[PDB]
Amino acid sequence: MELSFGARAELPRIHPVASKLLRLMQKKETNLCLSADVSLARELLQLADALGPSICMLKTHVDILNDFTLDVMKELITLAKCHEFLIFEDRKFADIGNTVKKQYEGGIFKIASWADLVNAHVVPGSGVVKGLQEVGLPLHRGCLLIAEMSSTGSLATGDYTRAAVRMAEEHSEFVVGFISGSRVSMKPEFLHLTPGVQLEAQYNSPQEVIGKRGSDIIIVGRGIISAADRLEAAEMYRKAAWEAYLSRLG
Amino acid sequence: MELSFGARAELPRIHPVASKLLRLMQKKETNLCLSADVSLARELLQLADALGPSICMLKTHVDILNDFTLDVMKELITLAKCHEFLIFEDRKFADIGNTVKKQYEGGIFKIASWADLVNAHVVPGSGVVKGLQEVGLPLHRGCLLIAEMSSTGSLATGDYTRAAVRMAEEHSEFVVGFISGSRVSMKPEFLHLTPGVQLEQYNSPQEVIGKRGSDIIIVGRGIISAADRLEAAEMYRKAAWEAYLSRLG
Ligand SMILES: Nc1ccn([C@@H]2O[C@H](COP(=O)(O)O)[C@@H](O)[C@H]2O)c(=O)n1
Ligand SMILES: Nc1ccn([C@@H]2O[C@H](COP(=O)(O)O)[C@@H](O)[C@H]2O)c(=O)n1
């Protein structure tokens, strides 16, 4: 029952952020999330500008930017709007209660003011999502739950993954999908994003990740960022990921 | 076979940061960590100065400080040195590889430059600690592993906790203890810090330290939301300390 990204964006219970994301994916023929693992704002903004047309999402780590300012994120928003991609702050929230709300809304970074998407760990319980949602729902933001992990020694068991899915379903007004290695929910309203993606050779190809394992979006860092021609690199990954998606439809 | 903090500070295999902490705990008669959950630097520094003598450790969330600058952390270090407490940045690191290293060492906060201790989740595997250690070892820092959650719906099963302990042992050069609700390791070189503490899921200091074997209580609102924060801090210090004395025998 595979539906296109475009049709999934029209589902009755789709979250507005997921619908926005699915629509630009279909329009631009990209299911590539760029992991912009850089330490200087100038390089972040030049990557966002040049690769913006190739990507559906730019994943940031604002807490490694040596020259972070809110004006930097203002300029990033302008690029996200112009090129049509979402901003995903890969903050991996894990606290609960009023702390996690302030970590999302306040402090120096004011993440919720500029990030369309954030992610959260589910190990402490739904308290992480609940705290974030007290901020994010008012702001029409979305959250991704880290449901699986392939790093060596990961402790996310089958039960851990099931709990993450159930948490997503109970908080579907804020949770819009998962970080995982494969499809973990059969509900088409949720997005699946997968890191550990390589064309060349523990990582897997887009065909494996998007085609066989049913994920929606590939997260790619060094395979693009460390290349000389980052644009051609992004395009290689975009074409691979998109053609894996198309072959899944039939 | 229950040892004093002072005796544990001298154990052959003790980490230098743990030894420093255990020594000042014994000296000052405190096993209280203040959770300084405040959003302005003025309140942070006024609490650190006033409660410094009563605490072994000040737990910070630098990323909720609306007026963070490095000069604020310079003032905090000055107070930590003067009153003799460690700074524990409760960052709950969870990323791996070069990203965690930059999150610990770099960015705006430069955590490793001022935090004696940080904590880390173990769910992604040992990559979190390995990455932190590449920064933290050179800087003589220490790390705490979150071995038990203590929150509703926690997913940390028995096997998860055991894995956290095994990971701490394999990384004893950098990992100095655990965040947990009770003693998770019988090795006295490791420290146990327990959150969720109130005199009245909260547990009492006498339950946490006396019966559950933990070393340090982490207390936020029980102190910070009281009118007289200094008297509240002294109440928690004496409860936790007397609980620790009662188990030595
Ligand atoms: N097995 C993996 C591999 C990469 N990643 C993440 O994917 C992003 C991109 O990593 P690369 O530079 O390896 O492509 C990083 O945030 C990295 O931590 C992951 O979470 N799990
Ligand atoms: N049951 C609890 C209670 C508090 N805590 C921790 O204690 C801090 C808040 O403490 P207070 O409830 O004392 O204000 C947070 O860092 C939180 O993570 C916990 O981990 N589990």
Side-chain angles (χ1 to χ4, degrees), chain B residues 177-210:
Chain B
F178 304 97
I179 309 306
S180 65
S182 66
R183 185 182 291 158
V184 291
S185 172
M186 303 303 296
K187 288 173 186 296
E189 296 83 2
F190 289 121
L191 282 134
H192 296 89
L193 290 73
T194 295
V197 177
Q198 283 188 328
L199 300 180
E200 287 290 357
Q201 299 174 24
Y202 280 120
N203 292 102
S204 67
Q206 266 285 357
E207 170 72 20
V208 169
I209 302 297

PDB file of all heavy atoms in Angstrom, chain B residues 177-210:
ATOM      1  N   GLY B 177      31.729   7.573  37.901  1.00  0.00           N
ATOM      2  CA  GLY B 177      30.566   7.100  38.622  1.00  0.00           C
ATOM      3  C   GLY B 177      29.324   7.105  37.760  1.00  0.00           C
ATOM      4  O   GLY B 177      29.392   7.110  36.526  1.00  0.00           O
ATOM      5  N   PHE B 178      28.183   7.123  38.450  1.00  0.00           N
ATOM      6  CA  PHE B 178      26.899   6.858  37.838  1.00  0.00           C
ATOM      7  C   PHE B 178      25.842   7.813  38.368  1.00  0.00           C
ATOM      8  O   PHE B 178      25.890   8.248  39.524  1.00  0.00           O
ATOM      9  CB  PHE B 178      26.417   5.438  38.192  1.00  0.00           C
ATOM     10  CG  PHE B 178      27.383   4.346  37.825  1.00  0.00           C
ATOM     11  CD1 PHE B 178      28.266   3.819  38.757  1.00  0.00           C
ATOM     12  CD2 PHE B 178      27.393   3.835  36.541  1.00  0.00           C
ATOM     13  CE1 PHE B 178      29.147   2.807  38.401  1.00  0.00           C
ATOM     14  CE2 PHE B 178      28.265   2.830  36.186  1.00  0.00           C
ATOM     15  CZ  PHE B 178      29.142   2.314  37.113  1.00  0.00           C
ATOM     16  N   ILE B 179      24.877   8.121  37.505  1.00  0.00           N
ATOM     17  CA  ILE B 179      23.579   8.632  37.930  1.00  0.00           C
ATOM     18  C   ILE B 179      22.656   7.427  38.033  1.00  0.00           C
ATOM     19  O   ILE B 179      22.451   6.708  37.048  1.00  0.00           O
ATOM     20  CB  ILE B 179      23.012   9.650  36.932  1.00  0.00           C
ATOM     21  CG1 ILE B 179      24.039  10.731  36.612  1.00  0.00           C
ATOM     22  CG2 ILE B 179      21.699  10.256  37.496  1.00  0.00           C
ATOM     23  CD1 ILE B 179      24.593  11.430  37.826  1.00  0.00           C
ATOM     24  N   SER B 180      22.100   7.203  39.214  1.00  0.00           N
ATOM     25  CA  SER B 180      21.249   6.045  39.441  1.00  0.00           C
ATOM     26  C   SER B 180      20.403   6.314  40.672  1.00  0.00           C
ATOM     27  O   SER B 180      20.640   7.268  41.417  1.00  0.00           O
ATOM     28  CB  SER B 180      22.086   4.783  39.654  1.00  0.00           C
ATOM     29  OG  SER B 180      22.843   4.883  40.849  1.00  0.00           O
ATOM     30  N   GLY B 181      19.420   5.445  40.888  1.00  0.00           N
ATOM     31  CA  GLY B 181      18.573   5.536  42.060  1.00  0.00           C
ATOM     32  C   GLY B 181      19.057   4.752  43.248  1.00  0.00           C
ATOM     33  O   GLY B 181      18.491   4.870  44.339  1.00  0.00           O
ATOM     34  N   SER B 182      20.094   3.950  43.059  1.00  0.00           N
ATOM     35  CA  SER B 182      20.661   3.126  44.114  1.00  0.00           C
ATOM     36  C   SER B 182      22.053   2.711  43.659  1.00  0.00           C
ATOM     37  O   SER B 182      22.467   2.995  42.531  1.00  0.00           O
ATOM     38  CB  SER B 182      19.799   1.889  44.371  1.00  0.00           C
ATOM     39  OG  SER B 182      19.814   1.034  43.239  1.00  0.00           O
ATOM     40  N   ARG B 183      22.771   2.020  44.537  1.00  0.00           N
ATOM     41  CA  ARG B 183      24.070   1.470  44.182  1.00  0.00           C
ATOM     42  C   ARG B 183      23.903   0.447  43.067  1.00  0.00           C
ATOM     43  O   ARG B 183      23.125  -0.504  43.199  1.00  0.00           O
ATOM     44  CB  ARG B 183      24.678   0.816  45.418  1.00  0.00           C
ATOM     45  CG  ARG B 183      26.085   0.299  45.235  1.00  0.00           C
ATOM     46  CD  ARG B 183      26.557  -0.365  46.519  1.00  0.00           C
ATOM     47  NE  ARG B 183      26.763   0.610  47.583  1.00  0.00           N
ATOM     48  CZ  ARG B 183      26.754   0.321  48.878  1.00  0.00           C
ATOM     49  NH1 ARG B 183      26.491  -0.900  49.312  1.00  0.00           N
ATOM     50  NH2 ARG B 183      27.011   1.285  49.759  1.00  0.00           N
ATOM     51  N   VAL B 184      24.615   0.661  41.961  1.00  0.00           N
ATOM     52  CA  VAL B 184      24.600  -0.274  40.847  1.00  0.00           C
ATOM     53  C   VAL B 184      25.909  -1.046  40.712  1.00  0.00           C
ATOM     54  O   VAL B 184      25.937  -2.059  39.996  1.00  0.00           O
ATOM     55  CB  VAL B 184      24.235   0.406  39.509  1.00  0.00           C
ATOM     56  CG1 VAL B 184      22.778   0.834  39.518  1.00  0.00           C
ATOM     57  CG2 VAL B 184      25.135   1.601  39.235  1.00  0.00           C
ATOM     58  N   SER B 185      26.981  -0.605  41.362  1.00  0.00           N
ATOM     59  CA  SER B 185      28.267  -1.278  41.321  1.00  0.00           C
ATOM     60  C   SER B 185      28.778  -1.456  42.741  1.00  0.00           C
ATOM     61  O   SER B 185      28.639  -0.556  43.574  1.00  0.00           O
ATOM     62  CB  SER B 185      29.294  -0.453  40.545  1.00  0.00           C
ATOM     63  OG  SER B 185      30.583  -1.026  40.667  1.00  0.00           O
ATOM     64  N   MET B 186      29.375  -2.610  43.014  1.00  0.00           N
ATOM     65  CA  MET B 186      29.968  -2.854  44.322  1.00  0.00           C
ATOM     66  C   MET B 186      31.397  -2.335  44.430  1.00  0.00           C
ATOM     67  O   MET B 186      31.973  -2.383  45.522  1.00  0.00           O
ATOM     68  CB  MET B 186      29.931  -4.349  44.655  1.00  0.00           C
ATOM     69  CG  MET B 186      28.536  -4.962  44.630  1.00  0.00           C
ATOM     70  SD  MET B 186      27.363  -4.160  45.745  1.00  0.00           S
ATOM     71  CE  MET B 186      28.108  -4.504  47.338  1.00  0.00           C
ATOM     72  N   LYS B 187      31.978  -1.843  43.339  1.00  0.00           N
ATOM     73  CA  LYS B 187      33.331  -1.293  43.380  1.00  0.00           C
ATOM     74  C   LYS B 187      33.300   0.061  44.076  1.00  0.00           C
ATOM     75  O   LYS B 187      32.621   0.978  43.594  1.00  0.00           O
ATOM     76  CB  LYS B 187      33.872  -1.131  41.963  1.00  0.00           C
ATOM     77  CG  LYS B 187      34.221  -2.432  41.253  1.00  0.00           C
ATOM     78  CD  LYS B 187      34.595  -2.156  39.797  1.00  0.00           C
ATOM     79  CE  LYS B 187      34.814  -3.437  39.015  1.00  0.00           C
ATOM     80  NZ  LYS B 187      35.967  -4.207  39.551  1.00  0.00           N
ATOM     81  N   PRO B 188      34.011   0.237  45.195  1.00  0.00           N
ATOM     82  CA  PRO B 188      33.930   1.514  45.924  1.00  0.00           C
ATOM     83  C   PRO B 188      34.629   2.670  45.228  1.00  0.00           C
ATOM     84  O   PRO B 188      34.432   3.820  45.642  1.00  0.00           O
ATOM     85  CB  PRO B 188      34.567   1.191  47.283  1.00  0.00           C
ATOM     86  CG  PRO B 188      35.515   0.073  46.987  1.00  0.00           C
ATOM     87  CD  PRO B 188      34.873  -0.743  45.885  1.00  0.00           C
ATOM     88  N   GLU B 189      35.414   2.413  44.176  1.00  0.00           N
ATOM     89  CA  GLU B 189      36.019   3.503  43.418  1.00  0.00           C
ATOM     90  C   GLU B 189      34.989   4.314  42.633  1.00  0.00           C
ATOM     91  O   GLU B 189      35.289   5.443  42.226  1.00  0.00           O
ATOM     92  CB  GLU B 189      37.089   2.961  42.463  1.00  0.00           C
ATOM     93  CG  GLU B 189      38.289   2.310  43.143  1.00  0.00           C
ATOM     94  CD  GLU B 189      38.039   0.863  43.531  1.00  0.00           C
ATOM     95  OE1 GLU B 189      36.938   0.346  43.242  1.00  0.00           O
ATOM     96  OE2 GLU B 189      38.946   0.241  44.124  1.00  0.00           O
ATOM     97  N   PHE B 190      33.790   3.778  42.407  1.00  0.00           N
ATOM     98  CA  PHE B 190      32.770   4.501  41.659  1.00  0.00           C
ATOM     99  C   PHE B 190      31.855   5.268  42.604  1.00  0.00           C
ATOM    100  O   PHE B 190      31.547   4.805  43.706  1.00  0.00           O
ATOM    101  CB  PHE B 190      31.920   3.554  40.806  1.00  0.00           C
ATOM    102  CG  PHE B 190      32.646   2.981  39.623  1.00  0.00           C
ATOM    103  CD1 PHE B 190      32.797   1.612  39.487  1.00  0.00           C
ATOM    104  CD2 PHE B 190      33.167   3.808  38.644  1.00  0.00           C
ATOM    105  CE1 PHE B 190      33.467   1.079  38.399  1.00  0.00           C
ATOM    106  CE2 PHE B 190      33.837   3.281  37.552  1.00  0.00           C
ATOM    107  CZ  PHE B 190      33.986   1.915  37.432  1.00  0.00           C
ATOM    108  N   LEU B 191      31.420   6.441  42.158  1.00  0.00           N
ATOM    109  CA  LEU B 191      30.461   7.264  42.878  1.00  0.00           C
ATOM    110  C   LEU B 191      29.056   7.073  42.325  1.00  0.00           C
ATOM    111  O   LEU B 191      28.857   6.839  41.130  1.00  0.00           O
ATOM    112  CB  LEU B 191      30.861   8.736  42.785  1.00  0.00           C
ATOM    113  CG  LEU B 191      32.008   9.022  43.756  1.00  0.00           C
ATOM    114  CD1 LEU B 191      33.108   9.843  43.117  1.00  0.00           C
ATOM    115  CD2 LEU B 191      31.484   9.715  45.009  1.00  0.00           C
ATOM    116  N   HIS B 192      28.077   7.167  43.220  1.00  0.00           N
ATOM    117  CA  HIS B 192      26.668   7.079  42.863  1.00  0.00           C
ATOM    118  C   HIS B 192      25.987   8.383  43.247  1.00  0.00           C
ATOM    119  O   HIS B 192      25.997   8.770  44.420  1.00  0.00           O
ATOM    120  CB  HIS B 192      25.991   5.914  43.583  1.00  0.00           C
ATOM    121  CG  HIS B 192      26.524   4.572  43.192  1.00  0.00           C
ATOM    122  ND1 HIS B 192      27.585   3.975  43.837  1.00  0.00           N
ATOM    123  CD2 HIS B 192      26.136   3.708  42.225  1.00  0.00           C
ATOM    124  CE1 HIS B 192      27.829   2.800  43.284  1.00  0.00           C
ATOM    125  NE2 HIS B 192      26.964   2.615  42.303  1.00  0.00           N
ATOM    126  N   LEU B 193      25.396   9.050  42.263  1.00  0.00           N
ATOM    127  CA  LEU B 193      24.624  10.264  42.476  1.00  0.00           C
ATOM    128  C   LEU B 193      23.170   9.951  42.167  1.00  0.00           C
ATOM    129  O   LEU B 193      22.870   9.340  41.136  1.00  0.00           O
ATOM    130  CB  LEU B 193      25.119  11.384  41.566  1.00  0.00           C
ATOM    131  CG  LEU B 193      26.493  11.976  41.890  1.00  0.00           C
ATOM    132  CD1 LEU B 193      27.626  11.043  41.525  1.00  0.00           C
ATOM    133  CD2 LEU B 193      26.637  13.327  41.168  1.00  0.00           C
ATOM    134  N   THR B 194      22.271  10.363  43.054  1.00  0.00           N
ATOM    135  CA  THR B 194      20.864  10.022  42.909  1.00  0.00           C
ATOM    136  C   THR B 194      19.991  11.265  42.853  1.00  0.00           C
ATOM    137  O   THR B 194      19.990  12.061  43.808  1.00  0.00           O
ATOM    138  CB  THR B 194      20.416   9.121  44.064  1.00  0.00           C
ATOM    139  OG1 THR B 194      21.104   7.867  43.987  1.00  0.00           O
ATOM    140  CG2 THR B 194      18.911   8.908  44.009  1.00  0.00           C
ATOM    141  N   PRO B 195      19.218  11.453  41.778  1.00  0.00           N
ATOM    142  CA  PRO B 195      18.231  12.539  41.760  1.00  0.00           C
ATOM    143  C   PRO B 195      16.870  12.093  42.267  1.00  0.00           C
ATOM    144  O   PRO B 195      16.658  10.919  42.592  1.00  0.00           O
ATOM    145  CB  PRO B 195      18.170  12.921  40.278  1.00  0.00           C
ATOM    146  CG  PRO B 195      18.409  11.607  39.573  1.00  0.00           C
ATOM    147  CD  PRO B 195      19.305  10.769  40.471  1.00  0.00           C
ATOM    148  N   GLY B 196      15.934  13.034  42.327  1.00  0.00           N
ATOM    149  CA  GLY B 196      14.612  12.753  42.843  1.00  0.00           C
ATOM    150  C   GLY B 196      14.586  12.653  44.353  1.00  0.00           C
ATOM    151  O   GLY B 196      14.103  11.663  44.909  1.00  0.00           O
ATOM    152  N   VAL B 197      15.081  13.682  45.031  1.00  0.00           N
ATOM    153  CA  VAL B 197      15.265  13.652  46.475  1.00  0.00           C
ATOM    154  C   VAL B 197      14.505  14.811  47.099  1.00  0.00           C
ATOM    155  O   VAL B 197      14.659  15.966  46.681  1.00  0.00           O
ATOM    156  CB  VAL B 197      16.756  13.692  46.852  1.00  0.00           C
ATOM    157  CG1 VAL B 197      16.924  13.747  48.357  1.00  0.00           C
ATOM    158  CG2 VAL B 197      17.478  12.473  46.287  1.00  0.00           C
ATOM    159  N   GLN B 198      13.682  14.487  48.094  1.00  0.00           N
ATOM    160  CA  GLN B 198      12.984  15.457  48.915  1.00  0.00           C
ATOM    161  C   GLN B 198      12.841  14.875  50.312  1.00  0.00           C
ATOM    162  O   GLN B 198      12.682  13.662  50.477  1.00  0.00           O
ATOM    163  CB  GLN B 198      11.565  15.709  48.408  1.00  0.00           C
ATOM    164  CG  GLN B 198      11.444  16.590  47.203  1.00  0.00           C
ATOM    165  CD  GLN B 198       9.990  16.916  46.911  1.00  0.00           C
ATOM    166  OE1 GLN B 198       9.096  16.107  47.166  1.00  0.00           O
ATOM    167  NE2 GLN B 198       9.745  18.113  46.394  1.00  0.00           N
ATOM    168  N   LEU B 199      12.858  15.749  51.320  1.00  0.00           N
ATOM    169  CA  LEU B 199      12.678  15.286  52.692  1.00  0.00           C
ATOM    170  C   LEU B 199      11.326  14.606  52.885  1.00  0.00           C
ATOM    171  O   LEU B 199      11.218  13.629  53.635  1.00  0.00           O
ATOM    172  CB  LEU B 199      12.819  16.463  53.657  1.00  0.00           C
ATOM    173  CG  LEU B 199      14.172  17.173  53.622  1.00  0.00           C
ATOM    174  CD1 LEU B 199      14.209  18.314  54.621  1.00  0.00           C
ATOM    175  CD2 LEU B 199      15.290  16.187  53.904  1.00  0.00           C
ATOM    176  N   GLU B 200      10.285  15.100  52.218  1.00  0.00           N
ATOM    177  CA  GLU B 200       8.925  14.617  52.473  1.00  0.00           C
ATOM    178  C   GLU B 200       8.648  13.312  51.735  1.00  0.00           C
ATOM    179  O   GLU B 200       9.345  12.973  50.778  1.00  0.00           O
ATOM    180  CB  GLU B 200       7.890  15.674  52.071  1.00  0.00           C
ATOM    181  CG  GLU B 200       7.806  16.875  53.003  1.00  0.00           C
ATOM    182  CD  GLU B 200       7.210  16.527  54.352  1.00  0.00           C
ATOM    183  OE1 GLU B 200       6.803  15.359  54.545  1.00  0.00           O
ATOM    184  OE2 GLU B 200       7.139  17.423  55.222  1.00  0.00           O
ATOM    185  N   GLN B 201       8.111  10.634  41.544  1.00  0.00           N
ATOM    186  CA  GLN B 201       8.976   9.721  42.277  1.00  0.00           C
ATOM    187  C   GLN B 201      10.095  10.463  43.005  1.00  0.00           C
ATOM    188  O   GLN B 201      11.175  10.682  42.451  1.00  0.00           O
ATOM    189  CB  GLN B 201       9.593   8.685  41.330  1.00  0.00           C
ATOM    190  CG  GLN B 201       8.587   7.795  40.622  1.00  0.00           C
ATOM    191  CD  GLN B 201       9.234   6.882  39.594  1.00  0.00           C
ATOM    192  OE1 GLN B 201      10.421   6.567  39.682  1.00  0.00           O
ATOM    193  NE2 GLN B 201       8.452   6.458  38.608  1.00  0.00           N
ATOM    194  N   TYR B 202       9.823  10.852  44.247  1.00  0.00           N
ATOM    195  CA  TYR B 202      10.824  11.410  45.141  1.00  0.00           C
ATOM    196  C   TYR B 202      11.082  10.427  46.276  1.00  0.00           C
ATOM    197  O   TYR B 202      10.168   9.738  46.739  1.00  0.00           O
ATOM    198  CB  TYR B 202      10.349  12.731  45.766  1.00  0.00           C
ATOM    199  CG  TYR B 202      10.491  13.954  44.888  1.00  0.00           C
ATOM    200  CD1 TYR B 202       9.379  14.706  44.526  1.00  0.00           C
ATOM    201  CD2 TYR B 202      11.736  14.375  44.449  1.00  0.00           C
ATOM    202  CE1 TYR B 202       9.506  15.833  43.732  1.00  0.00           C
ATOM    203  CE2 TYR B 202      11.873  15.496  43.656  1.00  0.00           C
ATOM    204  CZ  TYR B 202      10.758  16.223  43.300  1.00  0.00           C
ATOM    205  OH  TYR B 202      10.900  17.343  42.512  1.00  0.00           O
ATOM    206  N   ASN B 203      12.327  10.371  46.736  1.00  0.00           N
ATOM    207  CA  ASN B 203      12.682   9.595  47.915  1.00  0.00           C
ATOM    208  C   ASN B 203      13.449  10.488  48.880  1.00  0.00           C
ATOM    209  O   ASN B 203      13.982  11.534  48.499  1.00  0.00           O
ATOM    210  CB  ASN B 203      13.505   8.353  47.557  1.00  0.00           C
ATOM    211  CG  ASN B 203      12.698   7.329  46.781  1.00  0.00           C
ATOM    212  OD1 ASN B 203      12.821   7.222  45.562  1.00  0.00           O
ATOM    213  ND2 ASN B 203      11.860   6.578  47.485  1.00  0.00           N
ATOM    214  N   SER B 204      13.493  10.065  50.138  1.00  0.00           N
ATOM    215  CA  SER B 204      14.151  10.834  51.178  1.00  0.00           C
ATOM    216  C   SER B 204      15.660  10.617  51.137  1.00  0.00           C
ATOM    217  O   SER B 204      16.138   9.599  50.630  1.00  0.00           O
ATOM    218  CB  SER B 204      13.634  10.396  52.545  1.00  0.00           C
ATOM    219  OG  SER B 204      14.034   9.068  52.852  1.00  0.00           O
ATOM    220  N   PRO B 205      16.437  11.565  51.673  1.00  0.00           N
ATOM    221  CA  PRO B 205      17.886  11.323  51.786  1.00  0.00           C
ATOM    222  C   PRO B 205      18.225  10.091  52.609  1.00  0.00           C
ATOM    223  O   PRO B 205      19.154   9.355  52.253  1.00  0.00           O
ATOM    224  CB  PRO B 205      18.417  12.617  52.422  1.00  0.00           C
ATOM    225  CG  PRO B 205      17.401  13.664  52.029  1.00  0.00           C
ATOM    226  CD  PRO B 205      16.071  12.943  52.058  1.00  0.00           C
ATOM    227  N   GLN B 206      17.494   9.842  53.700  1.00  0.00           N
ATOM    228  CA  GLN B 206      17.773   8.663  54.515  1.00  0.00           C
ATOM    229  C   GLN B 206      17.508   7.379  53.735  1.00  0.00           C
ATOM    230  O   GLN B 206      18.218   6.381  53.909  1.00  0.00           O
ATOM    231  CB  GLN B 206      16.949   8.692  55.804  1.00  0.00           C
ATOM    232  CG  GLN B 206      17.676   9.295  57.009  1.00  0.00           C
ATOM    233  CD  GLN B 206      18.724   8.367  57.621  1.00  0.00           C
ATOM    234  OE1 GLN B 206      18.896   7.225  57.189  1.00  0.00           O
ATOM    235  NE2 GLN B 206      19.429   8.862  58.636  1.00  0.00           N
ATOM    236  N   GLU B 207      16.492   7.380  52.872  1.00  0.00           N
ATOM    237  CA  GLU B 207      16.243   6.211  52.033  1.00  0.00           C
ATOM    238  C   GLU B 207      17.327   6.063  50.967  1.00  0.00           C
ATOM    239  O   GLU B 207      17.847   4.964  50.750  1.00  0.00           O
ATOM    240  CB  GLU B 207      14.855   6.315  51.395  1.00  0.00           C
ATOM    241  CG  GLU B 207      14.561   5.277  50.320  1.00  0.00           C
ATOM    242  CD  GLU B 207      14.339   3.880  50.872  1.00  0.00           C
ATOM    243  OE1 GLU B 207      14.039   3.748  52.077  1.00  0.00           O
ATOM    244  OE2 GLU B 207      14.467   2.913  50.092  1.00  0.00           O
ATOM    245  N   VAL B 208      17.683   7.163  50.302  1.00  0.00           N
ATOM    246  CA  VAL B 208      18.586   7.096  49.152  1.00  0.00           C
ATOM    247  C   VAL B 208      20.003   6.751  49.594  1.00  0.00           C
ATOM    248  O   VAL B 208      20.661   5.879  49.010  1.00  0.00           O
ATOM    249  CB  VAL B 208      18.550   8.429  48.382  1.00  0.00           C
ATOM    250  CG1 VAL B 208      19.656   8.484  47.353  1.00  0.00           C
ATOM    251  CG2 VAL B 208      17.187   8.636  47.730  1.00  0.00           C
ATOM    252  N   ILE B 209      20.506   7.460  50.603  1.00  0.00           N
ATOM    253  CA  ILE B 209      21.874   7.258  51.069  1.00  0.00           C
ATOM    254  C   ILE B 209      21.944   6.078  52.031  1.00  0.00           C
ATOM    255  O   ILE B 209      22.832   5.224  51.931  1.00  0.00           O
ATOM    256  CB  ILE B 209      22.400   8.548  51.733  1.00  0.00           C
ATOM    257  CG1 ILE B 209      22.364   9.735  50.763  1.00  0.00           C
ATOM    258  CG2 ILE B 209      23.799   8.321  52.319  1.00  0.00           C
ATOM    259  CD1 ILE B 209      23.252   9.603  49.538  1.00  0.00           C
ATOM    260  N   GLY B 210      21.014   6.021  52.984  1.00  0.00           N
ATOM    261  CA  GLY B 210      21.128   5.045  54.055  1.00  0.00           C
ATOM    262  C   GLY B 210      20.821   3.629  53.606  1.00  0.00           C
ATOM    263  O   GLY B 210      21.566   2.694  53.914  1.00  0.00           O
TER     264      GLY B 210
END
